[PDB]
Write a protein that binds this ligand. Structure first.
Ligand SMILES: [Mg+2]
Ligand SMILES: [Mg+2]
Ligand SMILES: [Mg+2]
Ligand SMILES: [Mg+2]
Ligand SMILES: [Mg+2]
Ligand SMILES: [Mg+2]
Ligand SMILES: [Mg+2]
Ligand SMILES: [Mg+2]
Ligand SMILES: [Mg+2]
Ligand SMILES: [Mg+2]
Ligand SMILES: [Mg+2]
Ligand SMILES: [Mg+2]
Ligand SMILES: [Mg+2]
Ligand SMILES: [Mg+2]
Ligand SMILES: [Mg+2]
Ligand SMILES: [Mg+2]
Ligand SMILES: [Mg+2]
Ligand SMILES: [Mg+2]
Ligand SMILES: [Mg+2]
Ligand SMILES: [Mg+2]
Lengths: 201, 175, 190, 56, 139
RNA sequence: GCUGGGAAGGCCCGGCGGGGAAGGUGGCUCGGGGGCCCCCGAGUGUUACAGCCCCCCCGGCAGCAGCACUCGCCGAAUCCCGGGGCCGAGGGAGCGAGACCCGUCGCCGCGCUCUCCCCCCUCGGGGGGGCCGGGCCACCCCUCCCACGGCGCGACCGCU
RNA sequence: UGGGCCACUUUUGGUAAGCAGAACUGGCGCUGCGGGAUGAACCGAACGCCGGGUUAAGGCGCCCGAUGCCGACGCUCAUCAGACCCCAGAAAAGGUGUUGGUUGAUAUAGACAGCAGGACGGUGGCCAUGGAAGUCGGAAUCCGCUAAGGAGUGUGUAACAACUCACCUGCCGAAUCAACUAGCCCUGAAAAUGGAUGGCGCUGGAGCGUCGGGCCCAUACCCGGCCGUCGCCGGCAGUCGA
RNA sequence: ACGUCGCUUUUUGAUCCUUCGAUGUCGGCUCUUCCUAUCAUUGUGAAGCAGAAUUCACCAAGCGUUGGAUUGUUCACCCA
RNA sequence: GGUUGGCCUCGGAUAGCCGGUCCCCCGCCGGGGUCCGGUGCGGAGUGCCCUUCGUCCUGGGAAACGGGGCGCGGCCGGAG
């Protein structure tokens, strides 16, 4: 679509979310993925950590400063996964890669916005409940990420403000239902039109 | 032999009449095949092993599909078969629940592929019978012999994962 | 094969009550309150009667490996009931050929000091798990009493002491010194 | 049982292409006038024609 | 935790397939994936049906397993499943979806006008209630 | 259209019945429960306060590979209508007048008029019925031959 | 031109070889195109310049066209998982991982497993020796009491002793035990720059086996246009509006 | 032991595919990196592990693996 | 050179959830425990909001404690 598509990374499988995101940004859509530390990877934590440690071992023998760059933040890990699904060495792939923004936690532009979810990439439906999985946040922290603690505190502070906002939202909704009972004699004329046409059962 | 949903065929054939034998015997087989062309081909495959018959030296006098007599009644099917593994030949007895004989044999072909990696050219069905519930030997079949059977559907996986592809609400599993 | 239903029921005594929060069992008895959640196991826990307090664990459509979790949960809950009614008491004997093992019980039975194990100057400090209290029994010369409500914590504390007094670079068939769990019983002996 | 007469007419379609064909198969296909893929022709069925169909 | 169970007599709603939108009764259970199913008063003849396309409802009929369609129909009509189903919030949500989908352009226009007036009156009363709630003065 | 002249199935409380059971209804017994009255589990078995399967002394009605989407192969036993896309190559077709405003032409399929009556809309224009005789089939009678299949009766030949 | 080379199959020498030498057909050489990521030879298909349609082989998470099917049934968890002809890495042997199959055995006359009792006399049987008492060995292999107890299954002693099993019995009350077999998984499984199911990644599958329906596109097939070549040794001297 | 299944390419063969309009051909010295089939060191398991010493195996290549006589030697051998 | 209305936010569970409500505790609001509803999510992203022909006579309803100022001034919140 034309607007920015903000996705919540919590509970999403790394490669299934990355495949959906890569196709979206190739179709000219701006995609923002937040909370990349909540992304899951199928398989137990040890064998996923081994996969990253093998990635750490790949480096240029002659000059490691030229070699593969191993990004430790979960947002940059997810970004590199999307880059593996894009034709990033062409101008089209680079333009698509620029349309993607990834964050650890939820920064202030998007912590006050509604966040989408991709069911075809959620762990609850794509993965059998008896299988094991790893957290991208824990995996990143144990391969070098330094900001697991500070992002944890900032996410808790954000969730406290979100709880306050939600309570006001419930209070306004309760007042909405009370008002809808109060103005009832002068609303049933338009309510029956809605009920006739399938809105508002 | 490939597959699909198998159908049962009653194939009746005989040798061609000769001066030695004016009226040769008629032989009948039950063939589970995707279509009647495969059914006739499999019939010659079996009567060549059993009798000294051939497609060129004989003829098929009848080939008609056998319809299920009780397609609305659940029953248990015992199936005797022989198949070729990678290192030998084995006789197997298997049990399935279905409404049709052909459907149970199709279940057997999928099940031999799933558990034993047996292809349909390896498998050789030699007997299919509708057995009573008290004659069943497989606990997977026998656990459905309960007049008060009752179970929930615990973990309902969302299958409309792309309608919508993006949504605010995370799917519910419990129903 | 997937079994249609595999279920097992435990019986809860009168003096102890069990509360369920989904798959989180809270067992409250005279000796205290124990909590343990089984959210790693997909089962159906239900309380059956107000008369005899039965707890039933169900597993629908389970294979071989996940039918083994029904008895595991029932035994864990029975250990929870046992802990909040009788408690768990692991006795430990310290055995030694030559050097007596000196055990000093530090603050409130939470820290254990092993001094002269095999005659070495290093002092082992083993901290008991929370809710576990260690003491020196007055009935035996060299005996420790570990008491607590959770069997998992009491036996893990006893294993911490047992693995602390480990002989190294020697023949452990000959050098038998150390502290070993002698018996696993209860408190209040009922 | 009533056994119908064996069919006396066949329709033959060539399904393979013209690459790497053995000399005998190539000759019989030329005699059946099937020199191109997805070419079709009617063949009167008898012992002589059937044994040519078995070759190709 | 479970409240609805696959069992003989259980009424299920077919969510997709050749018989989507109809009610059926479970007459027998086969092989953990399918069930002998039969809607005698809802135009679904007896046939196998996978559990993946069923959604269990709250109604349970009383008839023995693999009884004939006659007895399934008698139980269905005696329990009046057709009328009881139509009175549930589930069926009314289904009906509302259907009459919203078949809404025409003129009907969309009249809904736009009715909802426009309805929302303005309601949100005016909401603001009026907010001021009344804000009029609190007590230590 | 065919098929096992489909298989199942629906309705006729299918009726006179017979038999069999179990994934066992009611009842009975035992063991656990809800305020001696109502539930849950385990046994017994043959219909009871449910049902299932097979055979009937025999079925009848509807529908019929179903517009209750259970499971096929088809079309001389097959026709009608609609939608989307790509394309428009060619350029003297006149045997008739002796072409001349101009080959609206060949093959093919049709309509009307050179016959007369009516009928219906419409103010002359439109839409219809045809208008008399023959065969062939459908209905009834009785009527020959042939083909194919079945059954029975023989006489001949061959085989014990 | 008279250097050939490759593949299926047959085939000789060689431990073998991307080795050397034959037979048959096809190919590459001389050949582009679709697929096999990549590649002289594999799979499909051979080619004038184009439009439309449809396919082959092969595919359809994203790179990357196409499954964004409410696809079907199972199998499989790998702390070196697996992932498609040629083909680009593995064996014998193992597994109380799990799944299916075969054969056999026990059991309400009380299986199996646990806990609990008994496990005797002749006889410390014979021949062996330094001592071998059931238990280093050579032969024998019995009888009585019995519910049952081998003149002995192991531990142990210089020999004894003391344990333990076979066997019987109590509590327990309903199924249980064994040997095979073959699927996936695991062990077996060690190399040098950092690295390769093509990559990212994938575990209600994007893995493995058996199947369905759609869909994608080759220079292949079908329809049409245009160019040329070949063929009809085609037609036109009748410009004959009479 | 008799047999039997493998792996490796630090041996030597076998072959002759690349290079004969040229890829400088042994050893040493210098210097870096890699492998593990681990000699030592860290943590372990087993012993015919009492202790000391030693032997077998596991995780494991982080770190180290030396000075000399003779010989061009690689190898070898000896001294320490 | 793109684009051709907006969504201003609970945390989450998935063998479970959401909403509402009286008593207890924490400085007049939240957290619990009862109790009542809903759950193929209807307090629903398969959703919600806004909705554009403009004006003139001209009535009825909605409102009238209302609506608009790139009008001033003050204060508050928000630091990832
Ligand atoms: Mg136990
Ligand atoms: Mg030592
Ligand atoms: Mg080919
Ligand atoms: Mg029809
Ligand atoms: Mg033209
Ligand atoms: Mg050669
Ligand atoms: Mg050449
Ligand atoms: Mg050539
Ligand atoms: Mg070629
Ligand atoms: Mg290619
Ligand atoms: Mg390849
Ligand atoms: Mg084309
Ligand atoms: Mg591909
Ligand atoms: Mg695509
Ligand atoms: Mg392996
Ligand atoms: Mg050469
Ligand atoms: Mg050569
Ligand atoms: Mg040079
Ligand atoms: Mg050089
Ligand atoms: Mg090693």
């Amino acid at each position: 679509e034309v607007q920015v598509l903000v996705l919540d990374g919590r509970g999403h499988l790394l490669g299934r979310l990355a495949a959906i995101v890569a196709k979206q940004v190739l179709l000219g859509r701006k995609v923002v993925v937040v909370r990349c530390e909540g992304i899951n990877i199928s398989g137990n934590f040890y064998r996923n950590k081994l996969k990253y440690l093998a990635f750490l071992r790949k480096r240029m023998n002659t000059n490691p400063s030229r070699g593969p760059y191993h990004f430790r933040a979960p947002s940059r890990i997810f970004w590199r996964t999307v880059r593996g699904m894009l034709p990033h060495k062409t101008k089209r792939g680079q333009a698509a890669l620029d349309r993607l923004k990834v964050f650890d936690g939820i920064p202030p532009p998007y912590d006050k916005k509604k966040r989408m979810v991709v069911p075809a990439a959620l762990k609850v439906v794509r993965l059998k409940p008896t299988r094991k999985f790893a957290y991208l946040g824990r995996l990143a922290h144990e391969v070098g990420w330094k900001y697991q603690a500070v992002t944890a505190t900032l996410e808790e502070k954000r969730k406290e403000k979100a709880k306050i906002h939600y309570r006001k939202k419930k209070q306004l909704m309760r007042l909405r239902k009370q008002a809808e009972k109060n103005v009832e004699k002068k609303i049933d004329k338009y309510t029956e039109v809605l009920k006739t046409h399938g809105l508002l059962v | 032999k490939a597959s699909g949903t198998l159908r049962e065929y009653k194939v009746v054939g005989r040798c061609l009449p000769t001066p030695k034998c004016h009226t040769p015997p008629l032989y009948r087989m039950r063939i589970f095949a995707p279509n009647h062309v495969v059914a006739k081909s499999r019939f010659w495959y079996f009567v060549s092993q059993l009798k000294k018959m051939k497609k060129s030296s004989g003829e098929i006098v009848y080939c008609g599909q056998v319809f299920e007599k009780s397609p609305l009644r659940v029953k248990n099917f015992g199936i005797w078969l022989r198949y070729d593994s990678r290192s030998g030949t084995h006789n197997m007895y298997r049990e399935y629940r279905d409404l049709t004989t052909a459907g149970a044999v199709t279940q057997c072909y999928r099940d031999m592929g799933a558990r034993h990696r047996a292809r349909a050219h390896s498998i050789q069905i030699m007997k299919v019978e509708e057995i009573a519930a008290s004659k069943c030997r497989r606990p997977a079949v026998k656990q459905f012999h309960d007049s008060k059977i009752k179970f929930p559907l615990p973990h309902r996986v969302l299958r409309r994962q792309h309608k919508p592809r993006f949504t605010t609400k995370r799917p519910n599993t419990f129903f | 094969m997937k079994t249609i239903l595999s279920n097992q029921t435990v019986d809860i005594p009168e003096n102890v009550d069990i509360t369920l929060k989904g798959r989180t069992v809270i067992v409250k008895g005279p000796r205290g309150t124990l909590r343990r959640d089984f959210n790693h196991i997909n089962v159906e826990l239900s309380l059956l009667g107000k008369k005899k307090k039965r707890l039933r664990v169900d597993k629908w459509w389970g294979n071989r490996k996940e039918l083994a979790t029904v008895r595991t949960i029932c035994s864990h809950v029975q250990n929870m009931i046992k802990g909040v009614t009788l408690g768990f008491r692991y006795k430990m004997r310290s055995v030694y050929a030559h050097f007596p093992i000196n055990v000093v019980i530090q603050e409130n039975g939470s820290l254990v000091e092993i001094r002269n194990f095999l005659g070495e100057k290093y002092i082992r400090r083993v901290r008991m798990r929370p809710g576990v209290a260690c003491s020196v029994s007055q009935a035996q010369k060299d005996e420790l009493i570990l008491e607590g409500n959770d069997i998992e914590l009491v036996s893990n504390s006893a294993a911490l002491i047992q693995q602390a007094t480990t002989v190294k670079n020697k023949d452990i068939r000959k050098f038998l010194d150390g502290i070993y769990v002698s018996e696993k019983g209860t408190v209040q002996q009922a | 049982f009533y056994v119908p007469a064996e069919p006396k007419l066949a329709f033959v379609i060539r399904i393979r292409g013209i690459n790497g064909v053995s000399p005998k198969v190539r000759k019989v296909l030329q005699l059946l006038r099937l020199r191109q893929i997805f070419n079709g022709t009617f063949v009167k069925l008898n012992k002589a024609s059937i044994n040519m169909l078995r070759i190709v | 935790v479970f409240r609805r169970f696959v069992e003989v007599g259980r009424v299920a709603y077919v969510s997709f397939g050749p018989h989507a939108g109809k009610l059926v009764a479970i007459v027998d259970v086969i092989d953990q994936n399918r069930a002998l199913v039969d809607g005698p008063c809802t135009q679904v003849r007896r046939q196998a049906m996978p559990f993946k396309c069923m959604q269990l409802t709250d109604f349970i009929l009383k008839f023995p397993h693999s009884a004939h369609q006659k007895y399934v129909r008698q139980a269905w009509q005696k329990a009046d499943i057709n009328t009881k189903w139509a009175a549930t919030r589930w069926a009314k949500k289904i009906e509302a979806r259907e009459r919203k989908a078949k809404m025409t352009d003129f009907d969309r226009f009249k809904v736009m006008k009715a909802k426009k007036m309805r929302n303005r009156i309601i949100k005016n009363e909401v603001k009026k209630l907010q001021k009344a709630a804000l009029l609190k003065a007590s230590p």
